[PDB]
Symmetry: C2
Amino acid sequence: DCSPGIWQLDCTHLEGKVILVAVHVASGYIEAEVIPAETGQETAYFLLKLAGRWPVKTVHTDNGSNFTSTTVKAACWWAGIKQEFGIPVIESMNKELKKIIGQVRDQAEHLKTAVQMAVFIHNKKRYSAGERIVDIIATDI
Amino acid sequence: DCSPGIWQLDCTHLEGKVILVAVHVASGYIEAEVIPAETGQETAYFLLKLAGRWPVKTVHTDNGSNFTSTTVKAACWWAGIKQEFGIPVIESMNKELKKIIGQVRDQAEHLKTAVQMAVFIHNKKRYSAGERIVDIIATDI
């Protein structure tokens, strides 16, 4: 959890929709996306996007069956991502995100937009989570 | 262009599909996404995602009419993003991205995946663009 390369991935539901939530464990920085279904293809596609922006070395999840998909294993293999085993946080983070979404829900037509507005508010809330991840990654370099 | 908050947004086409490409001007770091159509709604949604991850203060584009959409102005207003006027780079960057996509195209079924694999290769190519943006943002803090 001290290591700057540990992320946690989890899908949560809201308004009959699926939200994929990634948390940088050391900083609390969040990325979220509404996906059409809880499929390995959506997970694999999200991991490639995440690995292209940040250093992703190991990933954890609260539902191990999420990572059994052959498509997910292919994406982790290509990007050099290992499965994390040192975590026996997202409960709090998912409830935290669902709360901020409720505050901004009225300001956006679709749930798509509310999720990104909530991610914006979380990462800048104030150091902020957005500043802390950059600081953590910078020193590690 | 020295300022760490300047981004450039442009849509490019490949295989009858639209790719939205964002470039961090000071570092050369890239984010890209295949979008269904060149609409203001897709642009506005992409900007909110970008502003939630990085500090986005001003944005430039090669096609000014991209930013006339009332939906785009609403997103820039809510996230506190101004239109950049100090740039009279994406030509090179879009050709660079299209080249890397061609190298990896055979390794992925859909163009969606090839674009993210190309973004991955660009930002880690090696400092790398992914390291340089974090360093730039860190010192600015």
